[PDB]
Amino acid sequence: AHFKEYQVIGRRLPTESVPEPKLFRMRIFASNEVIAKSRYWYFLQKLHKVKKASGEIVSINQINEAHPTKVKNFGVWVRYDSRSGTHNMYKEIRDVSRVAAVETLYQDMAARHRARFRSIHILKVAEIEKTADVKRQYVKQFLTKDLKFPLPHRVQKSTKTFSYKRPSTFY
Amino acid sequence: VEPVVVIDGKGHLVGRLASVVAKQLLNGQKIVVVRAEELNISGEFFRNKLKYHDFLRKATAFNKTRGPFHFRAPSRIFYKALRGMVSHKTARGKAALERLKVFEGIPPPYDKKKRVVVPQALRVLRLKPGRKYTTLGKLSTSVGWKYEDVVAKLEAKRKVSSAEYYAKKRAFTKKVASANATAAESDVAKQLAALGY
Amino acid sequence: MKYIQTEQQIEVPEGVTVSIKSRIVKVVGPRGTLTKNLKHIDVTFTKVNNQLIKVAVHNGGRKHVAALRTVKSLVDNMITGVTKGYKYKMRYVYAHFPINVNIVEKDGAKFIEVRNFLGDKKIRNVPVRDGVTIEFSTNVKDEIVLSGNSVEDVSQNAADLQQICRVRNKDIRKFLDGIYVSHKGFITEDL
Amino acid sequence: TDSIVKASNWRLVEVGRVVLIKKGQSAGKLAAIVEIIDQKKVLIDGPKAGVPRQAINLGQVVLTPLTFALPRGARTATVSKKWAAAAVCEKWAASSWAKKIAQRERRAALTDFERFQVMVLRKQKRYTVKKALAKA
Amino acid sequence: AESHRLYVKGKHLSYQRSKRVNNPNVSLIKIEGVATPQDAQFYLGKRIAYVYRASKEVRGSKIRVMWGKVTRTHGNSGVVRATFRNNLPAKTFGASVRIFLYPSNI
RNA sequence: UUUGCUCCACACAAUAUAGAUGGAUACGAAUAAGGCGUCCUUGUGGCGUCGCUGAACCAUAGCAGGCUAGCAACGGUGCACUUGGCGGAAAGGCCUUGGGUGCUUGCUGGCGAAUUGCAAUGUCAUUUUGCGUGGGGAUAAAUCAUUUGUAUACGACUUAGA
RNA sequence: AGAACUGGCGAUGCGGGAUGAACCGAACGUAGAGUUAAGGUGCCGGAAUACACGCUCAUCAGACACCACAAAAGGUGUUAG
RNA sequence: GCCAGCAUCAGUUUUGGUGGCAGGAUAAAUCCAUAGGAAUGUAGCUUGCCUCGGUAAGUAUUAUAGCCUGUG
């Protein structure tokens, strides 16, 4: 769905031999609360000798980013499964918030490489703090000085089925 | 909101126009389509010519007379598309098709009546720029239609008399527009403008 | 990748004025007038300084921007063809049979008449397309010259003459008889 | 003679272009383009009309011929100052674009009674107009 | 004047139906000038009349009326559901029906 | 063939309705371009303006739309006549001259409505046919039977016969 | 052709998969109202010619499990790495 | 007796308007103040050559535009 960024912190269950576990933390992009907890258990089992039954979640806190109005340019690294192998990737999405960038990435992967939600790992999402540190052309294009372009051939949507004059696409 | 709706078919997609019109008849609306020869089908002319030839080889093996009929007129090609979007085999479906007339060019009395368009079927609004499209008049001629030259001649004549009608119309509407401007800034007009008129 | 904006520049010399319609292009020059229909490209034109006319595509793809340079090279050859002109020279190649070529008239249609190609009794008739004038240049043995304003009309008529003299049912690597273009220059060369 | 090329200039988008919101919570208010995100969506701001800063698809808005000077990345405070300085509010009102909209909203508010004045006045104005259209 | 109409124009679309099964107990009505379920909420409960002519006088007229009313909206495009005291014949799909203004909430 | 046929006007019936309930309201062409206004040196011209939907324009008040009076202009509309054109793609309609006539809500007056009782489509449309009047208009063929063979199983075909 | 566990058809209609003993949904007295399943919403056909991001032009395109087929090997076609 | 209209209700349900609260980084934002920084570099200055004034590049970190980040 529309994504939200949560932080999930979990740990192994305390015991007499080893109390005070390490309290691992991980940032998850998910539609709702239940998925964020699930994806944390999914990914944590891939690093440490732990699972849902042998540990606990201590906290979850949704992270909404500082500047929902300033336009960023995000460098994103992923790890996804094709029909034949597993491949890493790096791209940019230029948009207004971190979550909308991930929401673009999932659609972008699903459109170009037919990668569904299950077969995608989001490695890290970072802002490119410096212009001219952009290496892909499709986002480097919009960074020129005094950028301006028209929108030719505008198509009006008609409410009534019949129009009494031929439409014009000026804009 | 209309007894009879006459559609300028030029610059329309045959399938989207057929769908829009088919619904209109099933809802009780009488439709007349004119200028079928200027209808468009999306796809390069070679693509649409092959499709008709693949259609042309389907016939009843043991008697070609009772087989499918391959109608070659631009009006008939549009009619075939519309008949498939209607349950033409039932009494209600036959009643619907009685509310339809498809013409080639703009014949009499429909030549002096208003023509409308269907924007959701119009080619300049539907198709992406650069996409290749076919014109039904050209496609019909390649498969056996005989009256491209007849229709073009009769539309050259019709448009000349139509431009004569419009030139007089523009002269009269200038004369009326001047009168309304003079009759403006009057106390009656001021009160009308206050009410939105 | 849907380039936002790509454009080219069309230089206009002193003696010509480029008059562009919605997308219909007319170039007028000392050698005449040329016209072309460009409605199938969906480009936009704009004049900068009455000596330079730009053409641009906004939000264009691989094929859309590829057609941008083609339009510039079409109008450029339109301007070039009316300032300098296009001249194509073809030679006659034959081993045993002299290829006999003449200009004839058939109801005023200006056909090119070709005889004795490989000893054939066939006469090959090539119409001379309007705007292309053809003269058998002297001081060179077995040469023909085609010239006109539009390159497209000149080159096609040169190609049509070459195409009509193809050798069939033989090893064309050995039987090389035919008329071939040896030069493509300008009428007002080295002006 | 002179070489002539039809200009074909149409409502290019930039920082400072005034847009009109077609659909959404605003649905009819004026806003100014502040940043260009991508070819299909931009960041706008409508502080005078109450429209907040948000990214929006360009299909949700319609550009207006009005334009003014904003530095790129202009926050809400500075757009308000440059909006009043450029006098965009009544420049929009003076245009025939806003007058037709104001005409529609006035025709919708007409009660049954004042729809009776309209017909009475229109017949009076018709009498004067058609009288004038008998001697020319 | 020229106009004496106190009803909204409407067309009888079809019965309530699946693609292979229909319900003749419910009729589908299109109201002119109505394109949303939000707009169609104004005509819920209005009285609907189907007027038709016949060659036989029954009680002092040759015009017969099938009375009904609008029950709820149907779809996203302003179509409404109606139920009549006797089910509409289904020969009248695409026939015109009158949506009266009573009962009134204005 | 016992007064038949056709057209015109109303007179009453029967018949039926794929479904009036103010107006189907007329350039062409382009859509990476156009419409309109104006000007000139008439063009692929200059300048100005418009679109961002018909949510428009026109029409629209009066007993389902009555009866009378005056004022202001000489306009608007319907109707039957009349003058001249245009239209053959299925033209069967469009424009126009003159006079007459009714109405005019362009403005100001007078009289009437009730009781269908608190809603009941509350009946005003056009399809065809028939019987009557009164007023014009015009007085045929085909088939069977006979016959021919350029035809033919029979039908059918092709000829002939006051 | 032959077995294991379970669920089914046989013995079973109904909505859906156009069509079908076995699939999906759901099992059934006679009705009314409301809401849904699986499947769908251009027209046939009840229901958005809904909204959004991309990709594809196919001189045999593609179009929804069971299921009604297509492989190896190739392509400065085009897109992203 | 047959068929309906309205009103006040009861059960089931469908669709709107609106009020008060409680959470979260006691929302993040906008906004206000302060410090620092940068260019897709604003003013100013210099250079280059221009239809007397705007070009082109160098400087210039807010000036005759502003922007970013941190803290409150």
UniProtKB/Swiss-Prot annotation, chain A:
It is found in: Cytoplasm. Belongs to the eukaryotic ribosomal protein eL20 family. There is a cross-link at residues 124, 130, 148 (Glycyl lysine isopeptide (Lys-Gly) (interchain with G-Cter in ubiquitin)). Keywords: Cytoplasm, Isopeptide bond, Phosphoprotein, Ribonucleoprotein, Ribosomal protein, Ubl conjugation. The modification Phosphoserine is found at residue 31. It comes from the Eukaryota. Coiled coil: none annotated. InterPro entries: Ribosomal_eL20, Ribosomal_eL20_dom, Ribosomal_eL20_eukaryotes. PANTHER family: 60S RIBOSOMAL PROTEIN L18A (PTHR10052). This is Large ribosomal subunit protein eL20A. Component of the large ribosomal subunit (LSU). Mature yeast ribosomes consist of a small (40S) and a large (60S) subunit. The 40S small subunit contains 1 molecule of ribosomal RNA (18S rRNA) and 33 different proteins (encoded by 57 genes). The large 60S subunit contains 3 rRNA molecules (25S, 5.8S and 5S rRNA) and 46 different proteins (encoded by 81 genes). eL20 forms multiple interactions with RNA and proteins in the central protuberance, connecting components of core functional centers that are located far apart. The keyword GTP-binding does not apply. Signal peptide: none annotated. One of its GO terms (molecular function) is structural constituent of ribosome. Present with 54300 molecules/cell in log phase SD medium. One of its GO terms (cellular component) is cytosol. GO terms for biological process: cytoplasmic translation. Its main location: cytoplasm.
UniProtKB/Swiss-Prot annotation, chain C:
Disulfide bonds: none annotated. Keywords: Cytoplasm, Ribonucleoprotein, Ribosomal protein. It is found in: Cytoplasm. One of its GO terms (molecular function) is structural constituent of ribosome. GO terms for cellular component: cytosol; cytosolic large ribosomal subunit. GO terms for biological process: cytoplasmic translation. InterPro entries: Ribosomal_uL6-like, Ribosomal_uL6-like_a/b-dom_sf, Ribosomal_uL6_a/b-dom, Ribosomal_uL6_CS2. Present with 52400 molecules/cell in log phase SD medium. There are 2 genes for uL6 in yeast. PANTHER family: 60S RIBOSOMAL PROTEIN L9, 60S/50S RIBOSOMAL PROTEIN L6/L9. Belongs to the universal ribosomal protein uL6 family. Component of the ribosome, a large ribonucleoprotein complex responsible for the synthesis of proteins in the cell. The small ribosomal subunit (SSU) binds messenger RNAs (mRNAs) and translates the encoded message by selecting cognate aminoacyl-transfer RNA (tRNA) molecules. The large subunit (LSU) contains the ribosomal catalytic site termed the peptidyl transferase center (PTC), which catalyzes the formation of peptide bonds, thereby polymerizing the amino acids delivered by tRNAs into a polypeptide chain. This is Large ribosomal subunit protein uL6A. It comes from Saccharomyces cerevisiae (strain ATCC 204508 / S288c). The gene is RPL9A.
Swiss-Prot record, chain D:
N-terminally acetylated by acetyltransferase NatA. InterPro entries: KOW, Rib_uL2_dom2, Ribosomal_eL14, Ribosomal_eL14_dom, Translation_prot_SH3-like_sf. SUPFAM superfamilies: Translation proteins SH3-like domain. It is found in: Cytoplasm. GO terms for biological process: cytoplasmic translation; macroautophagy; maturation of LSU-rRNA; ribosomal large subunit assembly; ribosomal large subunit biogenesis. GO terms for molecular function: RNA binding; structural constituent of ribosome. Belongs to the eukaryotic ribosomal protein eL14 family. Component of the ribosome, a large ribonucleoprotein complex responsible for the synthesis of proteins in the cell. The small ribosomal subunit (SSU) binds messenger RNAs (mRNAs) and translates the encoded message by selecting cognate aminoacyl-transfer RNA (tRNA) molecules. The large subunit (LSU) contains the ribosomal catalytic site termed the peptidyl transferase center (PTC), which catalyzes the formation of peptide bonds, thereby polymerizing the amino acids delivered by tRNAs into a polypeptide chain. One of its GO terms (cellular component) is nucleolus. Keywords: Acetylation, Cytoplasm, Ribonucleoprotein, Ribosomal protein. It comes from Saccharomyces cerevisiae (strain ATCC 204508 / S288c). CDD domains: eL14. The gene is RPL14A. Present with 45300 molecules/cell in log phase SD medium. There are 2 genes for eL14 in yeast. Gene3D superfamilies: 2.30.30.30, 6.10.250.2270. Its main location: cytoplasm. This is Large ribosomal subunit protein eL14A.
From Swiss-Prot, chain E:
It is found in: Cytoplasm. N-terminally acetylated by acetyltransferase NatA. There are 2 genes for eL33 in yeast. This is Large ribosomal subunit protein eL33A. PROSITE patterns: RIBOSOMAL_L35AE (PS01105). Keywords: Acetylation, Cytoplasm, Isopeptide bond, Ribonucleoprotein, Ribosomal protein, Ubl conjugation. It holds the Pfam family Ribosomal_L35Ae. InterPro entries: Ribosomal_eL33, Ribosomal_eL33_CS, Ribosomal_eL33_sf, Transl_B-barrel_sf. GO terms for molecular function: structural constituent of ribosome. Component of the ribosome, a large ribonucleoprotein complex responsible for the synthesis of proteins in the cell. The small ribosomal subunit (SSU) binds messenger RNAs (mRNAs) and translates the encoded message by selecting cognate aminoacyl-transfer RNA (tRNA) molecules. The large subunit (LSU) contains the ribosomal catalytic site termed the peptidyl transferase center (PTC), which catalyzes the formation of peptide bonds, thereby polymerizing the amino acids delivered by tRNAs into a polypeptide chain. The lineage of its organism: Eukaryota, Fungi, Dikarya, Ascomycota, Saccharomycotina. Belongs to the eukaryotic ribosomal protein eL33 family. One of its GO terms (biological process) is ribosomal large subunit assembly. There is a cross-link at residue 46 (Glycyl lysine isopeptide (Lys-Gly) (interchain with G-Cter in ubiquitin)). GO terms for cellular component: cytosol; cytosolic large ribosomal subunit.
